[PDB]
Design a protein around this motif. Structure first.
Motif, short mmCIF file in Angstrom:
data_model
loop_
_atom_site.label_atom_id
_atom_site.label_comp_id
_atom_site.label_asym_id
_atom_site.label_seq_id
_atom_site.Cartn_x
_atom_site.Cartn_y
_atom_site.Cartn_z
N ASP A 78 12.43 8.08 -4.89
CA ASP A 78 11.68 7.71 -3.70
C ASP A 78 12.40 6.73 -2.76
O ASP A 78 11.90 5.65 -2.49
CB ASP A 78 10.27 7.20 -4.03
N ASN A 79 13.57 7.12 -2.26
CA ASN A 79 14.22 6.37 -1.19
C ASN A 79 14.49 7.28 -0.02
O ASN A 79 14.63 8.50 -0.20
CB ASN A 79 15.50 5.68 -1.68
N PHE A 102 1.18 10.28 -4.33
CA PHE A 102 1.46 9.44 -3.15
C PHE A 102 2.77 8.69 -3.29
O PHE A 102 2.78 7.51 -3.59
CB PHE A 102 0.34 8.43 -2.87
N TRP A 103 3.88 9.40 -3.09
CA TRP A 103 5.19 8.80 -3.04
C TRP A 103 5.51 8.40 -1.57
O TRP A 103 5.78 9.26 -0.75
CB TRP A 103 6.20 9.83 -3.55
N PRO A 104 5.46 7.10 -1.25
CA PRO A 104 5.61 6.64 0.15
C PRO A 104 6.86 7.16 0.85
O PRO A 104 6.72 7.74 1.90
CB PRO A 104 5.63 5.12 0.03
N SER A 105 8.06 7.00 0.29
CA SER A 105 9.23 7.45 1.04
C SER A 105 9.19 8.94 1.28
O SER A 105 9.54 9.42 2.35
CB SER A 105 10.54 7.04 0.36
N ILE A 108 6.52 9.39 4.03
CA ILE A 108 6.93 8.76 5.30
C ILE A 108 8.19 9.35 5.93
O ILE A 108 8.24 9.55 7.15
CB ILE A 108 7.10 7.24 5.13
N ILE A 126 -3.72 2.35 0.07
CA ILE A 126 -2.63 3.31 0.17
C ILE A 126 -3.14 4.64 0.73
O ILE A 126 -2.39 5.38 1.37
CB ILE A 126 -1.93 3.52 -1.18
N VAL B 7 0.46 2.01 -6.19
CA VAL B 7 1.56 2.46 -5.34
C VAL B 7 1.90 1.38 -4.32
O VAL B 7 3.07 1.11 -4.06
CB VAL B 7 1.19 3.77 -4.63
N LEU B 8 0.87 0.78 -3.74
CA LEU B 8 1.07 -0.21 -2.71
C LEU B 8 1.87 -1.40 -3.24
O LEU B 8 2.77 -1.91 -2.57
CB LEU B 8 -0.28 -0.68 -2.17
N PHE B 11 5.48 -0.57 -3.84
CA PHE B 11 6.21 -0.37 -2.58
C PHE B 11 6.47 -1.70 -1.92
O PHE B 11 7.54 -1.94 -1.32
CB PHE B 11 5.35 0.48 -1.66
N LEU B 78 9.07 0.37 -6.50
CA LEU B 78 9.56 1.72 -6.25
C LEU B 78 11.08 1.72 -6.07
O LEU B 78 11.66 0.69 -5.71
CB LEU B 78 8.90 2.28 -5.00
N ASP B 79 11.72 2.86 -6.29
CA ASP B 79 13.17 2.86 -6.31
C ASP B 79 13.85 3.05 -4.93
O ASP B 79 14.61 3.99 -4.71
CB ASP B 79 13.75 3.84 -7.33
N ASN B 80 13.57 2.15 -4.01
CA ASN B 80 14.30 2.10 -2.74
C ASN B 80 14.82 0.70 -2.54
O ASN B 80 14.21 -0.25 -3.04
CB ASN B 80 13.42 2.54 -1.56
N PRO B 81 15.93 0.55 -1.78
CA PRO B 81 16.60 -0.76 -1.68
C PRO B 81 15.65 -1.85 -1.26
O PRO B 81 15.71 -2.95 -1.78
CB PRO B 81 17.64 -0.53 -0.56
N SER B 106 18.49 2.63 -7.54
CA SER B 106 18.36 1.58 -6.53
C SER B 106 18.14 0.23 -7.19
O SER B 106 18.69 -0.77 -6.76
CB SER B 106 17.26 1.89 -5.51
#
Ligand SMILES: [Cl-]
Ligand SMILES: [Cl-]
Ligand SMILES: [Cl-]
Ligand SMILES: [Cl-]
Ligand code: NI
Ligand code: NI
Lengths: 353, 354
Positions: A78-79, A102-105, A108, A126, B7-8, B11, B78-81, B106
């Motif tokens: 999820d990036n 609901f995976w945000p990246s 989005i 969310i 999730v929130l 994130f 979550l796995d983003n930078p 990440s």
């Protein structure tokens, strides 16, 4: 051990190029895939399918379902970059998300038209934020629709719960009158035998077909029923008052043979097995108090007038007698065609243009 | 569901993470990893504030009941930078211990926190080559795994054994008599066990069998089956029976010390095995059937240790029981356990010191 496919997730495979223009379907794990499968069977006819999953536990299972998709790949990490690379390689015509991933990246940063199915509302922040990002949402209840509409989601409808779709199979024909007890655990067997013993005082021709949760216990079950004073036999051979099934599968195909079904995992604290199956055949189902793992299904059956909770041997006798003397009309299957029809209609229309 | 996916929070990690600055960050993907690391966490918790993260939504409720072993609880970002860096900026952890694997790219690439991988094994995959060198310290199960990782240019890789083999005994119970203890037994295992025990009682007439079903719902059934074999029966606390059924949930691990030999089920039926380790922690030998495919590391460890015996039929069971009854088998699993634990704990404390 298990394949986590981390590299594939992070850097989606180049060979996705070979699936461009497909319909992208995401099933987080085995449950989601099974729930959506009846819809997938139809969509697979009009679209090439790109299937993704999240749980590493689903890979091996899904590989055995190659008939229902053209390409299989884990969901991208999820990036923004992994997700965009996935979308740029596969150029999917749309993405259908089964239930609530609901995976945000993912939501989005992709441009793919997005569709959520079998969703329900929790009222969480969310949801407020991501629901509006879907081009189409199909929910289980009109109540869920209301909540999402107040979230500024447009294109939101109720079609019912996909889990309530009948997936029947061929089925079997047998002459005689039967009760069918399926997915029965060792700790449930005695109460059912004692109930059926009380019943046979009245219905002398009635036979019980008894299908253990673990077919291996087919012999312990037999001996018990024998100890109780029943003539017994093993399936194929119908001579017994209690007929034991020792062959795997088969259970879903046996239900149509009976007037009433009893489904286990419910009289012991297991949480309930598959209550829906018998009712898809127009047969009422009886179960014990322990339905916590299948609660939505329970509440559905009670509302449809097709499911009946019993607390003890006595209530079981009483309920069995009621259903043997008055044939209870069951309309689960029409509801099934109705939910399936609604989902498939909206999806076909959305996909049309 | 009714489960919180949070999730929130993943994130956009919670601001309150601030109030946990300078903590040791321990990541246990789910319940299994947490329980595996628990004996080490218990000690580290004495010398460090603990920030505990998990991946599986299924762990949240469980972990909340473990509030005694941590100071802060939060799902993995979550796995983003950005989410990962925000987590790190808020919490300023002194170090991060990852239990088993969890190769989150990440997370591993974009955090500056010194990172420690524990109880790892080598699959030899490309993602291993790439990420393994980003850990400051890696503690592995075998010297064989160390050699593979060494060749990925990991520096600071050692083997301390498998954390899963650390004994977690508990108080234990005492009873007068001689017993064999069969635990986590399924319905389909009861007859080979009863057949074998009937043969043994001919010779050891004073021996009693404590029989603990996998599911207590099957106890009445078990008791009746024992009766059909002609055994005097009794329900736990009453030691009257030749066969003593256990009727209460839990209890099992505290019972083992009472016996000369344990039998652990899920193994004579195609289930894949229950907890073979527990009896051996009491210096008691354990016997099992052929279906140990879900506990195969553990099965192999026990065999090499001389504490676990696979039996295929009623005869080998009688044979193995008699052998173990006539000549007492020395068991050194507990010794091995203190060793594995001490090694892990030594390396960790030394890394964290400076
Ligand atoms: Cl944003
Ligand atoms: Cl920003
Ligand atoms: Cl952020
Ligand atoms: Cl930031
Ligand atoms: Ni099973
Ligand atoms: Ni269980």
């Amino acid at each position: 051990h298990m394949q986590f496919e981390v590299l594939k997730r992070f850097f989606p495979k180049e060979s996705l190029k070979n699936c461009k223009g497909a319909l992208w379907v995401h099933t987080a794990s085995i449950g989601e895939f099974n729930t959506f499968l009846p819809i997938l069977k139809e969509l697979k006819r009009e679209h090439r399918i790109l299937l993704t999953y999240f749980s590493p536990r689903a890979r091996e299972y899904l590989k055995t379902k190659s008939d229902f998709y053209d390409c299989l790949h884990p969901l991208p990490l999820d990036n923004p970059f992994s997700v965009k690379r996935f979308e740029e390689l596969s150029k999917p015509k749309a993405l259908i998300v089964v239930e609530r991933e609901f995976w945000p990246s993912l939501i989005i940063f992709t441009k793919v038209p997005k569709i959520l199915v079998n969703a329900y509302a929790k009222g969480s922040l969310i949801e407020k934020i991501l629901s509006k990002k879907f081009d189409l949402i199909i929910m289980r209840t009109q109540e869920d629709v209301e909540k999402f509409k107040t979230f500024g989601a447009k294109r939101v409808f109720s079609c019912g719960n996909l889990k309530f779709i009948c997936q029947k199979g061929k089925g079997i024909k047998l002459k005689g009158e039967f009760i069918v007890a399926g997915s029965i655990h060792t700790g449930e067997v005695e109460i059912i035998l004692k109930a059926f013993k009380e019943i046979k005082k009245t219905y002398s021709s009635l036979k019980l077909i008894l299908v253990p949760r673990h077919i291996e216990n087919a012999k312990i079950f037999e001996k018990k029923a024998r100890d109780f004073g029943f003539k017994t036999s093993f399936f194929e051979n119908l001579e017994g008052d209690v007929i034991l099934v020792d062959r795997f599968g088969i259970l879903k195909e046996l239900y149509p043979v009976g007037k009433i079904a009893i489904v286990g995992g419910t009289f012991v604290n297991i949480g309930g097995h598959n209550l829906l199956e018998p009712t898809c055949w127009g047969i009422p189902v009886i179960y014990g108090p322990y339905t916590h793992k299948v609660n939505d299904l329970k509440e559905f059956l009670e509302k449809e007038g097709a499911g009946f909770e019993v607390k003890n041997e006595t209530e079981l006798v009483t309920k069995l007698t009621e259903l043997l003397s008055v044939k209870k009309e069951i309309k689960v299957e029409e509801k099934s065609r109705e939910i399936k029809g609604c989902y498939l209609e909206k999806l076909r229309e959305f996909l049309r243009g």
